[PDB]
Short mmCIF file of C-alpha atoms and ligand atoms in Angstrom, two decimals:
data_model
loop_
_atom_site.label_atom_id
_atom_site.label_comp_id
_atom_site.label_asym_id
_atom_site.label_seq_id
_atom_site.Cartn_x
_atom_site.Cartn_y
_atom_site.Cartn_z
CA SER A 1 95.23 62.15 94.21
CA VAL A 2 92.43 59.63 93.90
CA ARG A 3 91.35 57.24 96.95
CA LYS A 4 89.40 54.05 96.83
CA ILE A 5 85.65 54.01 97.53
CA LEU A 6 84.25 51.63 99.90
CA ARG A 7 81.60 49.34 98.51
CA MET A 8 78.46 48.49 100.42
CA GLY A 9 79.08 45.83 102.80
CA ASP A 10 81.99 47.09 104.50
CA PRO A 11 80.92 48.33 108.02
CA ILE A 12 82.66 51.57 107.92
CA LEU A 13 79.89 52.81 105.78
CA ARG A 14 77.45 52.13 108.68
CA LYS A 15 79.27 53.87 111.51
CA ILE A 16 78.56 57.36 112.54
CA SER A 17 81.13 59.95 111.44
CA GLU A 18 82.02 62.52 114.12
CA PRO A 19 82.32 66.45 114.02
CA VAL A 20 85.28 68.48 112.72
CA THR A 21 87.02 70.76 115.09
CA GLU A 22 87.44 74.61 114.50
CA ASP A 23 91.15 73.53 114.40
CA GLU A 24 91.26 70.55 112.12
CA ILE A 25 90.14 72.88 109.28
CA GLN A 26 93.62 74.54 109.27
CA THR A 27 95.80 71.33 109.43
CA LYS A 28 97.73 70.85 106.28
CA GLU A 29 96.52 67.18 106.49
CA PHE A 30 92.83 68.53 106.14
CA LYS A 31 93.51 70.64 102.98
CA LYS A 32 94.79 67.45 101.48
CA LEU A 33 91.78 65.50 102.29
CA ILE A 34 89.34 67.93 100.67
CA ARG A 35 91.68 67.90 97.50
CA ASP A 36 91.53 64.11 97.52
CA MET A 37 87.87 64.08 98.01
CA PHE A 38 87.20 66.42 95.05
CA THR A 39 89.79 64.76 92.83
CA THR A 40 88.09 61.35 93.80
CA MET A 41 84.62 62.51 93.14
CA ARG A 42 85.52 64.12 89.86
CA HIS A 43 87.00 60.88 88.82
CA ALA A 44 83.98 58.64 89.63
CA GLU A 45 81.71 61.31 87.96
CA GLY A 46 79.82 62.03 91.08
CA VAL A 47 77.82 64.96 92.10
CA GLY A 48 78.86 64.60 95.85
CA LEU A 49 80.96 62.71 98.26
CA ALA A 50 81.26 61.86 101.91
CA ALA A 51 84.43 61.31 104.05
CA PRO A 52 83.30 57.82 105.16
CA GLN A 53 82.92 56.80 101.38
CA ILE A 54 86.70 56.91 101.30
CA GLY A 55 87.19 55.78 104.93
CA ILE A 56 87.25 58.71 107.19
CA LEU A 57 84.61 58.99 109.79
CA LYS A 58 84.28 62.78 109.81
CA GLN A 59 81.32 65.02 108.99
CA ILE A 60 82.85 66.13 105.83
CA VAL A 61 80.77 66.59 102.51
CA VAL A 62 81.80 67.65 99.09
CA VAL A 63 79.39 68.67 96.30
CA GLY A 64 79.69 70.26 92.85
CA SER A 65 79.16 69.08 89.23
CA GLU A 66 81.28 70.35 86.39
CA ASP A 67 78.51 70.92 83.88
CA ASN A 68 79.59 67.79 81.99
CA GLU A 69 78.83 64.50 80.14
CA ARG A 70 76.07 62.03 81.11
CA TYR A 71 73.22 63.74 82.88
CA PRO A 72 72.20 66.10 79.91
CA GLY A 73 69.04 66.27 81.99
CA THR A 74 70.49 66.98 85.43
CA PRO A 75 70.93 70.45 86.54
CA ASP A 76 74.09 71.61 88.26
CA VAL A 77 75.28 72.03 91.76
CA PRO A 78 77.97 74.60 92.81
CA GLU A 79 81.23 73.39 94.18
CA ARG A 80 81.12 73.51 97.85
CA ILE A 81 82.56 72.07 101.23
CA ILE A 82 79.91 70.97 103.67
CA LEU A 83 81.09 70.50 107.28
CA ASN A 84 79.10 69.27 110.35
CA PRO A 85 75.80 69.63 108.56
CA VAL A 86 72.55 69.18 110.33
CA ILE A 87 69.17 69.04 108.46
CA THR A 88 65.57 69.54 109.50
CA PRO A 89 62.55 68.69 107.23
CA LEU A 90 60.20 71.59 106.61
CA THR A 91 57.37 69.71 104.87
CA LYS A 92 55.87 66.38 104.66
CA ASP A 93 55.82 66.66 100.82
CA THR A 94 57.81 64.25 98.78
CA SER A 95 59.74 64.22 95.62
CA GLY A 96 60.62 60.87 93.98
CA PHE A 97 63.94 60.24 92.44
CA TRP A 98 66.20 57.52 91.17
CA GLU A 99 69.28 57.72 93.21
CA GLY A 100 72.60 55.69 92.75
CA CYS A 101 75.35 55.55 95.36
CA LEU A 102 79.08 55.31 94.22
CA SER A 103 79.27 52.71 97.00
CA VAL A 104 76.47 50.75 95.32
CA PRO A 105 77.87 50.71 91.58
CA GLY A 106 75.72 49.86 88.71
CA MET A 107 72.29 50.12 90.48
CA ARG A 108 69.78 52.64 90.92
CA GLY A 109 66.76 52.70 93.38
CA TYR A 110 63.76 54.85 93.70
CA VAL A 111 63.74 57.07 96.84
CA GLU A 112 61.37 59.59 98.24
CA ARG A 113 62.76 62.29 100.50
CA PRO A 114 61.35 65.58 101.72
CA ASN A 115 61.74 68.48 99.30
CA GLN A 116 62.00 71.38 101.73
CA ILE A 117 64.73 71.30 104.40
CA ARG A 118 66.64 73.70 106.69
CA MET A 119 70.19 72.91 106.74
CA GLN A 120 73.06 74.37 108.85
CA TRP A 121 76.72 73.88 108.15
CA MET A 122 80.11 75.46 107.91
CA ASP A 123 82.77 75.93 105.20
CA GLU A 124 86.46 75.75 104.94
CA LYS A 125 86.73 79.25 106.07
CA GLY A 126 84.69 78.78 109.22
CA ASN A 127 81.65 80.67 108.23
CA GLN A 128 78.45 79.11 109.57
CA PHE A 129 75.32 79.19 107.41
CA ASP A 130 71.55 78.59 108.07
CA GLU A 131 69.43 78.59 104.92
CA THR A 132 66.44 76.69 103.57
CA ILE A 133 67.14 74.31 100.63
CA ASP A 134 64.76 72.85 98.03
CA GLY A 135 64.51 70.80 94.93
CA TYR A 136 67.36 68.65 93.56
CA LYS A 137 69.91 70.23 95.89
CA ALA A 138 67.92 69.18 99.05
CA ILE A 139 68.04 65.69 97.51
CA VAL A 140 71.82 65.63 97.00
CA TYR A 141 72.41 67.26 100.47
CA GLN A 142 70.07 64.81 102.19
CA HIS A 143 71.74 61.76 100.46
CA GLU A 144 75.07 63.00 101.46
CA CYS A 145 74.23 63.92 104.91
CA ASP A 146 72.74 60.41 105.36
CA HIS A 147 76.13 58.60 104.92
CA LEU A 148 77.32 60.67 107.99
CA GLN A 149 74.83 58.93 110.02
CA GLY A 150 75.80 55.69 108.56
CA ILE A 151 72.85 55.40 106.06
CA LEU A 152 72.70 54.25 102.46
CA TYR A 153 69.88 55.13 100.21
CA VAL A 154 69.15 51.41 99.98
CA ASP A 155 67.91 51.87 103.49
CA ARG A 156 65.22 54.08 102.27
CA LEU A 157 63.98 52.28 99.15
CA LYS A 158 60.16 52.94 98.86
CA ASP A 159 59.50 49.51 97.21
CA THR A 160 62.37 46.91 96.54
CA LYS A 161 60.57 46.19 93.18
CA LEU A 162 61.84 49.68 92.16
CA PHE A 163 65.49 48.88 92.38
CA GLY A 164 67.82 47.32 89.82
CA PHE A 165 70.91 47.44 87.69
CA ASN A 166 71.35 50.54 85.36
CA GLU A 167 72.32 48.09 82.40
CA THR A 168 68.67 46.62 82.56
CA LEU A 169 66.67 49.59 84.05
CA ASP A 170 67.36 51.47 80.63
CA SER A 171 64.99 49.24 78.76
CA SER B 1 72.76 24.91 75.44
CA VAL B 2 73.13 27.77 77.78
CA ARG B 3 70.69 30.71 77.97
CA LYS B 4 70.97 34.23 79.26
CA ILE B 5 70.07 35.11 82.83
CA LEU B 6 67.80 38.18 83.48
CA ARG B 7 69.30 40.60 85.96
CA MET B 8 67.25 42.42 88.60
CA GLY B 9 65.52 45.35 87.17
CA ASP B 10 64.15 43.48 84.24
CA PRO B 11 60.29 43.44 84.86
CA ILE B 12 59.98 39.83 83.64
CA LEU B 13 61.31 38.90 87.09
CA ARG B 14 58.45 40.56 88.90
CA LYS B 15 55.60 38.94 86.81
CA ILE B 16 53.80 35.68 87.98
CA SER B 17 54.76 32.57 86.10
CA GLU B 18 51.73 30.36 85.15
CA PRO B 19 51.17 26.61 85.56
CA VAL B 20 52.44 23.76 83.38
CA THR B 21 49.76 21.51 81.60
CA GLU B 22 49.76 17.67 81.88
CA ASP B 23 50.33 17.94 78.05
CA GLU B 24 53.35 20.44 77.94
CA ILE B 25 55.54 18.07 79.85
CA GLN B 26 55.59 15.69 76.74
CA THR B 27 56.21 18.40 74.17
CA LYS B 28 59.73 17.86 72.74
CA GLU B 29 60.13 21.66 73.29
CA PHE B 30 59.65 21.13 76.97
CA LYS B 31 62.26 18.45 77.34
CA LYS B 32 64.61 20.88 75.63
CA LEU B 33 63.93 23.72 78.18
CA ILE B 34 64.72 21.45 81.18
CA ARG B 35 68.01 20.39 79.58
CA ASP B 36 68.63 24.10 78.82
CA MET B 37 67.75 25.14 82.48
CA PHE B 38 70.09 22.50 83.87
CA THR B 39 72.91 23.31 81.52
CA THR B 40 72.48 26.92 82.24
CA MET B 41 72.30 26.54 86.07
CA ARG B 42 75.35 24.04 86.03
CA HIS B 43 77.29 26.80 84.18
CA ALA B 44 76.70 29.53 86.67
CA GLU B 45 77.44 27.12 89.40
CA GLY B 46 73.98 27.47 90.87
CA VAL B 47 71.97 25.26 93.34
CA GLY B 48 68.61 25.93 91.61
CA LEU B 49 67.03 27.76 88.84
CA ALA B 50 63.56 28.93 87.79
CA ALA B 51 62.13 29.33 84.28
CA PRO B 52 61.46 33.07 84.65
CA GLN B 53 65.28 33.56 85.43
CA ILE B 54 65.83 32.72 81.84
CA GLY B 55 62.66 34.31 80.42
CA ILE B 56 59.94 31.86 80.68
CA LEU B 57 56.85 32.51 82.90
CA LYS B 58 55.97 28.82 83.77
CA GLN B 59 56.10 27.28 87.05
CA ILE B 60 59.24 25.25 86.52
CA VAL B 61 62.05 24.85 88.88
CA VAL B 62 65.36 22.87 88.72
CA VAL B 63 67.53 21.86 91.77
CA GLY B 64 70.72 20.03 92.32
CA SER B 65 74.08 20.22 93.91
CA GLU B 66 76.09 16.82 93.93
CA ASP B 67 79.83 16.82 94.97
CA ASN B 68 79.64 19.80 97.29
CA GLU B 69 83.20 20.67 96.40
CA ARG B 70 81.80 24.08 95.52
CA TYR B 71 79.98 24.93 98.62
CA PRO B 72 80.90 23.02 101.91
CA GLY B 73 78.82 24.10 104.83
CA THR B 74 75.80 22.76 103.31
CA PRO B 75 73.82 19.53 102.61
CA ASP B 76 73.36 17.96 99.32
CA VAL B 77 70.57 18.86 96.96
CA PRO B 78 69.41 15.91 94.82
CA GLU B 79 68.73 16.77 90.95
CA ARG B 80 65.12 17.23 90.49
CA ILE B 81 62.29 18.89 88.54
CA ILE B 82 59.65 20.84 90.57
CA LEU B 83 56.47 21.83 88.78
CA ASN B 84 53.41 23.87 89.91
CA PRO B 85 54.85 23.86 93.61
CA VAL B 86 52.82 25.20 96.46
CA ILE B 87 54.21 25.81 99.81
CA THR B 88 52.72 26.28 103.29
CA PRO B 89 54.78 27.08 106.36
CA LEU B 90 54.60 24.63 109.25
CA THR B 91 56.15 26.55 112.11
CA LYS B 92 57.08 30.24 113.03
CA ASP B 93 60.76 29.28 113.66
CA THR B 94 63.43 30.85 111.56
CA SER B 95 66.80 29.87 110.30
CA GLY B 96 68.89 32.70 109.11
CA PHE B 97 71.15 32.38 106.04
CA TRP B 98 73.09 34.54 103.55
CA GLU B 99 71.36 34.20 100.18
CA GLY B 100 72.49 35.13 96.81
CA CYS B 101 70.45 35.36 93.61
CA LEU B 102 71.62 34.63 90.13
CA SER B 103 69.65 37.55 89.04
CA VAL B 104 71.49 39.77 91.80
CA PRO B 105 75.04 39.06 90.90
CA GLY B 106 78.00 39.78 93.13
CA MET B 107 75.85 40.29 96.38
CA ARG B 108 74.57 38.48 99.25
CA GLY B 109 71.97 39.29 101.92
CA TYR B 110 70.85 37.85 105.32
CA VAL B 111 67.45 36.17 104.99
CA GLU B 112 65.24 34.49 107.57
CA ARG B 113 62.61 32.00 106.18
CA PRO B 114 60.40 29.24 107.89
CA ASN B 115 62.35 25.98 108.34
CA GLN B 116 59.42 23.57 108.14
CA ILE B 117 57.21 23.63 105.06
CA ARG B 118 54.54 21.37 103.37
CA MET B 119 55.26 21.48 99.63
CA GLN B 120 53.29 19.91 96.83
CA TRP B 121 54.66 19.61 93.27
CA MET B 122 54.93 17.28 90.21
CA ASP B 123 57.83 15.99 88.12
CA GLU B 124 58.58 15.41 84.37
CA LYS B 125 56.72 12.24 84.71
CA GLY B 126 53.54 13.53 85.99
CA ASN B 127 53.90 12.03 89.58
CA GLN B 128 52.32 14.46 91.98
CA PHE B 129 53.96 14.71 95.59
CA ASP B 130 53.15 16.26 98.99
CA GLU B 131 55.80 15.80 101.65
CA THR B 132 57.05 17.97 104.43
CA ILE B 133 60.49 19.51 103.81
CA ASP B 134 62.85 21.10 106.43
CA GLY B 135 66.37 22.57 106.68
CA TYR B 136 68.54 23.83 103.82
CA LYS B 137 66.32 22.26 101.18
CA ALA B 138 63.25 24.17 102.40
CA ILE B 139 65.45 27.36 102.25
CA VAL B 140 66.42 26.50 98.59
CA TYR B 141 62.86 25.37 97.65
CA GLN B 142 61.33 28.64 99.12
CA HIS B 143 63.98 30.65 97.40
CA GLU B 144 63.16 29.19 94.15
CA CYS B 145 59.40 29.06 94.60
CA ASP B 146 59.69 32.76 95.27
CA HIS B 147 60.90 33.51 91.68
CA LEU B 148 57.47 32.10 90.42
CA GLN B 149 55.45 34.62 92.46
CA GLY B 150 57.78 37.34 91.24
CA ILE B 151 59.79 37.72 94.36
CA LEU B 152 63.56 38.19 94.88
CA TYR B 153 65.21 37.50 98.24
CA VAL B 154 66.04 41.20 98.39
CA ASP B 155 62.42 41.57 99.05
CA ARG B 156 62.92 39.64 102.29
CA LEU B 157 66.12 41.21 103.67
CA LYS B 158 65.83 41.11 107.56
CA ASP B 159 67.82 44.21 107.83
CA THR B 160 69.28 46.22 104.90
CA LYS B 161 72.50 46.67 107.03
CA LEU B 162 73.18 42.88 106.43
CA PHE B 163 73.46 43.05 102.61
CA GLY B 164 76.45 43.93 100.52
CA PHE B 165 78.96 42.78 97.90
CA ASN B 166 80.80 39.42 98.23
CA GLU B 167 84.19 41.07 97.45
CA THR B 168 83.83 43.07 100.64
CA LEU B 169 81.71 40.76 102.90
CA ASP B 170 84.68 38.49 102.96
CA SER B 171 86.19 40.77 105.45
C1 BB2 C 201 70.77 62.93 95.80
C2 BB2 C 201 72.11 62.54 95.43
C3 BB2 C 201 72.32 62.25 93.96
C4 BB2 C 201 73.47 61.10 93.49
C5 BB2 C 201 74.70 61.49 94.51
C6 BB2 C 201 75.80 60.32 93.96
C7 BB2 C 201 77.01 60.57 94.83
C8 BB2 C 201 77.08 59.51 96.09
O1 BB2 C 201 77.08 58.34 95.87
N1 BB2 C 201 77.00 59.93 97.52
O2 BB2 C 201 77.02 59.26 98.20
C9 BB2 C 201 75.94 60.43 92.45
O3 BB2 C 201 76.65 61.08 92.00
N2 BB2 C 201 75.17 59.49 91.88
C10 BB2 C 201 75.00 59.37 90.42
C11 BB2 C 201 73.45 59.41 90.18
O4 BB2 C 201 72.77 58.52 90.70
N3 BB2 C 201 72.95 60.44 89.54
C12 BB2 C 201 73.63 61.74 88.86
C13 BB2 C 201 72.55 62.44 88.30
C14 BB2 C 201 71.16 61.98 89.06
C15 BB2 C 201 71.39 60.59 89.29
C16 BB2 C 201 70.78 59.65 88.18
O5 BB2 C 201 69.61 59.87 87.83
C17 BB2 C 201 75.59 58.08 90.02
C18 BB2 C 201 75.23 57.71 88.48
C19 BB2 C 201 77.01 57.96 90.18
C1 BB2 C 202 68.45 29.80 99.56
C2 BB2 C 202 69.76 29.50 98.89
C3 BB2 C 202 69.66 28.89 97.36
C4 BB2 C 202 70.27 29.79 96.45
C5 BB2 C 202 69.89 29.59 95.05
C6 BB2 C 202 70.75 30.44 94.06
C7 BB2 C 202 70.08 30.30 92.62
C8 BB2 C 202 68.95 31.38 92.35
O1 BB2 C 202 69.33 32.58 92.49
N1 BB2 C 202 67.72 31.04 91.98
O2 BB2 C 202 66.86 31.74 91.76
C9 BB2 C 202 72.06 30.17 94.31
O3 BB2 C 202 72.79 29.26 93.70
N2 BB2 C 202 72.60 30.89 95.27
C10 BB2 C 202 74.06 30.93 95.59
C11 BB2 C 202 73.95 31.03 97.19
O4 BB2 C 202 73.50 32.10 97.76
N3 BB2 C 202 74.52 29.91 97.89
C12 BB2 C 202 75.04 28.73 97.48
C13 BB2 C 202 75.36 27.95 98.62
C14 BB2 C 202 74.70 28.57 99.72
C15 BB2 C 202 74.38 30.10 99.45
C16 BB2 C 202 75.47 30.94 100.12
O5 BB2 C 202 76.58 30.49 100.59
C17 BB2 C 202 74.85 32.00 94.87
C18 BB2 C 202 75.99 32.57 95.88
C19 BB2 C 202 75.46 31.49 93.66
ZN1 ZN C 203 76.30 57.72 98.32
ZN1 ZN C 204 67.23 33.27 92.77
#
């Protein structure tokens, strides 16, 4: 099923989501959340989603793009569940990008983030990873990992001049 | 008649509007602009408006809120034309306030501006003033005068946490 997405302004979006236990991942309730998250993300045509975005303060992320409409210039991201992620920048180099949050509808803003990061997470199965990510994925990943710390891209705008509504940025 | 209002993102909103000549104020075309600005502001239920907001880069402002049946908690702002305004802060004291711009629809943000300023302008008749303004008016005035220097309140947000959509801030 599809859940409602919290819009910027609601304080839930600024609170810190907490860890997921090695037990919760087996609860029937959990499996349903994931499903919802996905079904929810897919609906709004997003590339990722964070538990809080729907109201749950748990370190749970969902990514993956179904190689579809809009973005015929945006690479793909494999479906995957990210739990209790922890990131570390590897370089001071930056890659600019116009981000848009689902919680901040109709607006995009220019945001520079590091382009080489070491992330450590865990999947629905319990396998723990520790690889080094780069390019677009790192961007996605970082954006999502931010919500877990109660942070929206708007907090990182390089220059407020470079921020506006889609309707008019496309002109 | 009513004119269209530029939304944040359009670059016109970031360019510097230029002065109005002692002649332009007599042009029949001018008088029409004013009428339009007002009729426009009145429609969107605003307290003020700047030429650029409708597409004209001329230092022209329009203010005015009579029967405050719309917004209570605030003073009255008498109808008036402000031309070629120049402000100077008089104190370092600040007064907080949740501003909303017509160019940034459906959103408010907390903004602290000085509360004692010396403004100098000129009216449709050509009379030049130089008085010291304070309280809510100064806020309005400063807000409006900002749009002439190509600045939106969003540029002055105290803390990005304190910024969101009306729909959800009223909770
Ligand atoms: C680095 C993360 C990239 C964006 C992630 C968001 C999902 C989100 O809001 N997470 O919190 C998204 O799908 N955003 C879309 C977006 O801004 N996109 C999708 C393709 C790239 C970019 C537009 O250039 C909007 C249109 C819904
Ligand atoms: C500094 C306050 C002056 C605001 C001027 C704007 C008009 C504007 O955006 N001009 O550029 C306005 O009407 N703003 C309204 C606004 O923010 N108001 C109106 C009453 C006080 C304040 C919020 O309550 C919006 C909500 C329509
Ligand atoms: Zn987001
Ligand atoms: Zn404004």
